[PDB]
Design a protein around this ligand. Structure first.
Ligand code: EFR
Ligand code: ZN
Ligand code: ZN
Length: 229
């Protein structure tokens, strides 16, 4: 099921949904996988997260051209770390409109990232303010609260059982919560639980650093995050 395309891996998760995986040899951490999503919505393609680098992100676009052959209407990125935003310049060079949490765009320079072109804002209940996410099709964007980072956002795919937790959620057998340098230790557990409650019917939880898992990923993540309080 894992289609190798250069140094990247693509896996179909549902009829109109694929996971993209790219790797970076991070000193002290090994060759770390990061996952994002590709969604076909009718005659256009929507991307969730870049790869780690511009070159890898350009290869995502190449794979899309070969396997889907429809224009990429937009990309949404889920926080201002390199695994999610490292390839912004490649999207811009391709003419693709980009979106991130306003706070991700604010943080991007100090995090070493290029900001997305458009800023999402969120209602008090966590759902994106719809005027800031126009033409998002089946992508349902939710801010669960600060957790992995202050700016982390999540995305459900309407018409599927899939919800994407990004770097907020770890798999149900993960040994730790990973990179906590920017984490909100007080609020992480509640934010993880809020993601689960926003997508109550999602049975396939996609995450940045592990293969897709069941809903046990959400409760295991929250349990690990309980230990940070
Ligand atoms: C660049 C990313 C931004 S989340 C990062 O800081 N990582 C270090 C921790 C590592 C944990 C793991 N191997 O699952 C994931 C990659
Ligand atoms: Zn991160
Ligand atoms: Zn990450």
């Amino acid at each position: 099921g894992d289609q190798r395309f250069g140094d990247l891996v693509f896996r179909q998760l549902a009829p109109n949904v694929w996971q993209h995986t790219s790797y970076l040899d991070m000193p002290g951490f090994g060759a770390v996988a990061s996952n994002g999503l590709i969604v076909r919505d009718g005659g256009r393609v929507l991307v969730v997260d870049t790869a780690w680098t511009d070159d890898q992100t350009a290869q995502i676009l190449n794979w899309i051209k070969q396997e889907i052959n429809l224009p990429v209407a937009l990309a949404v990125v889920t926080h201002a770390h390199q695994d999610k935003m490292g390839g912004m310049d490649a999207l811009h060079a391709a003419g693709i409109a980009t979106y991130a949490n306003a706070l991700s765009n604010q943080l991007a320079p100090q995090e070493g990232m290029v900001a997305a072109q458009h800023s999402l804002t969120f209602a008090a209940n966590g759902w994106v303010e719809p005027a800031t996410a126009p033409n998002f099709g089946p992508l349902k964007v939710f801010y669960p609260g600060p957790g992995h980072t202050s700016d982390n956002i999540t995305v459900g795919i309407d018409g599927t059982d899939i919800a994407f937790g990004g770097c907020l959620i770890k798999d149900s057998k993960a040994k730790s919560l990973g990179n906590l340098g920017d984490a909100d230790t007080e609020h992480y557990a509640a934010s993880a639980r809020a993601f689960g409650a926003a997508f109550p019917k999602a049975s396939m939880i996609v995450m940045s650093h592990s293969a897709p898992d069941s809903r046990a990923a959400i409760t295991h993540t929250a349990r690990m995050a309980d230990k940070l309080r």
